[PDB]
Write a protein that binds this DNA or RNA. Structure first.
Ligand SMILES: CC(=O)N[C@@H]1[C@@H](O)[C@H](O[C@@H]2O[C@H](CO)[C@@H](O[C@@H]3O[C@H](CO[C@H]4O[C@H](CO)[C@@H](O)[C@H](O)[C@@H]4O[C@@H]4O[C@H](CO)[C@@H](O[C@@H]5O[C@H](CO)[C@H](O)[C@H](O)[C@H]5O)[C@H](O)[C@H]4NC(C)=O)[C@@H](O)[C@H](O[C@H]4O[C@H](CO)[C@@H](O)[C@H](O)[C@@H]4O)[C@@H]3O)[C@H](O)[C@H]2NC(C)=O)[C@@H](CO[C@H]2O[C@@H](C)[C@@H](O)[C@@H](O)[C@@H]2O)O[C@@H]1O
Ligand SMILES: CC(=O)N[C@H]1[C@@H](O[C@@H]2[C@@H](OC[C@H]3O[C@H](O)[C@@H](O)[C@@H](O)[C@@H]3O)O[C@H](CO)[C@@H](O)[C@@H]2O)O[C@H](CO)[C@@H](O[C@H]2O[C@H](CO)[C@H](O)[C@H](O)[C@H]2O)[C@@H]1O
Ligand SMILES: [Ca+2]
Ligand SMILES: [Ca+2]
Lengths: 177, 208
RNA sequence: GGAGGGCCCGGAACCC
RNA sequence: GGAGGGCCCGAAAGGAACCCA
């Protein structure tokens, strides 16, 4: 089973994207050109492993990768529309409230969404997996949970989105009372 | 030998008396040497005989897919009883056993919140109506939308997502023409879950 | 008219 | 204090977590 890299890895440089070709003999070929930079790990049993760190720009340009071939999903990429939604008035009676980020109209589904405040990553947030919309693109929601007081006292939060179809592959939207 | 898969009932089926929940045991990868398959069902150890098996199905991949459906009782499923499906085929060393049941744990009542379109989205001709459903447990749930008491079909719902507090949440998005939003239509998000009163609740949403 | 381009029949869908 | 009750402690019993006025 040949697996693709993590969207973030392919998105942010700090990380390193890699493909995985999960008496074992490996032979990798990027668009044919056999390469020798792969690396494997320990082992398992019975019937594996081995990873080829790909280059951000290569994977992005849909280069082929085999050892079973694999590459970036095909189709015209579509840029995400990012919308922030404040908590429901009904949620204002709870100790914590939900700050919502809607990300829709993107393709491929490989994306990374984060929340921050004061240039610092927020901790308590969860993002749904991408969901196929009726128009061929995907959408997801990311929920930030914060103490009710951090919201009412004016703190400003930002939803950050990274995706290949975005200018500079990144965008963000803020949210505050 | 062939493969086996046990499917739980539809969340909405276990929650409404007007519906009949059921468990499904599907067997694929069945050979022709012996396309004969036997099913044995057990409810918490005890074997039951009310299962309905459907005749084998010729699959494009030159194989057979055989299905057995077992009717379960609403309260049984919701109370945690386990359902075991034992398959038997000579083209298989030992009989395959699959067991399924509702997830263990204290059920939690989902909190339902409707969110209007973002001001920025109002520049579009199409807008999103959002329904946030959080804090529920187990993850089995059903979500629907209506407008003025009538069925709305243009919505997509995310799968449940495990939250940091041990509970699940999800979002449901209904897409409507901006004009219908601005004209005062009253939209409503309906949720069905065991931990809800009467297993049902709904929140309205309309232009203020 | 171009030049690009998986989830309704190479195309629709999807930067000038 | 009363009653229930998978995704950190505990090897596990079980508990933290999670309706009762
Ligand atoms: C080996 C080979 O080459 N032969 C082929 C067969 O393998 C192939 O059959 C498939 O085998 C796979 C095993 O390799 C199976 O993988 C497992 O898939 C399940 C998810 O299955 C869901 O969803 C599928 C699509 O999302 C759908 O196709 C399946 O039929 C099934 O749908 C659900 O069915 C149940 C049963 O009816 C529904 O139950 C509901 O129950 C309610 C109350 O009980 C109520 O009554 C409802 O009315 C009733 O429907 C349920 O609603 C359906 N849900 C959906 C999604 O619609 C997955 O969970 C498994 O995951 C686990 O196992 C894997 C290992 O693979 C692990 O990695 C995971 O971690 C999990 O542990 C498996 O992935 C696959 O399901 C089999 N598919 C079928 C059709 O049975 C056959 C059939 O191929 C189909 O597709 C094409 C090839 C086509 O050309 C046709 O052949 C055919 O349509 O083909 C060869 O024989
Ligand atoms: C989250 C996760 O578990 N995925 C990790 C792993 O996924 C395997 C996955 O295999 C998919 C299945 O596909 C067919 O439909 C099946 O019939 C099977 O053939 C096959 O299993 O799920 C199975 C369990 O069912 C299991 O083998 C794995 O969970 O795939 C990668 C490792 O095998 C792993 O990705 C890693 O490597 C990539 C590089 O490509 C990333 O850069 C990361 O380093 C890391 O995530 C993946 O996360
Ligand atoms: Ca095509
Ligand atoms: Ca435990």
């Amino acid at each position: 089973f040949l697996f693709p890299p993590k969207p973030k890895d392919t998105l942010m440089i700090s990380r390193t994207p890699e493909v995985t070709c999960v008496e074992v003999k490996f032979n990798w070929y990027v668009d044919g050109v056999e390469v020798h930079n792969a690396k494997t790990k320990p082992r398992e049993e019975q019937y594996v492993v081995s990873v080829l760190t790909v280059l951000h720009q290569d994977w992005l340009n849909g280069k082929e990768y085999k050892c079973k071939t694999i590459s970036k999903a095909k189709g015209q990429p579509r840029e995400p529309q990012v919308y922030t939604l404040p908590p429901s008035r009904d949620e204002l009676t709870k100790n914590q409230v939900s700050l919502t980020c809607l990300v829709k109209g993107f393709y491929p589904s490989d994306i990374a969404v984060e929340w921050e405040s004061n240039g610092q990553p927020e901790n308590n947030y969860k993002t749904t997996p991408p969901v196929l919309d009726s128009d061929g693109s995907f959408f997801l929601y990311s929920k930030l949970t914060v103490d009710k007081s951090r919201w009412q006292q004016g703190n400003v939060f930002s939803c950050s989105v990274m995706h290949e179809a975005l200018h500079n592959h990144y965008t963000q939207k803020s949210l505050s009372l």
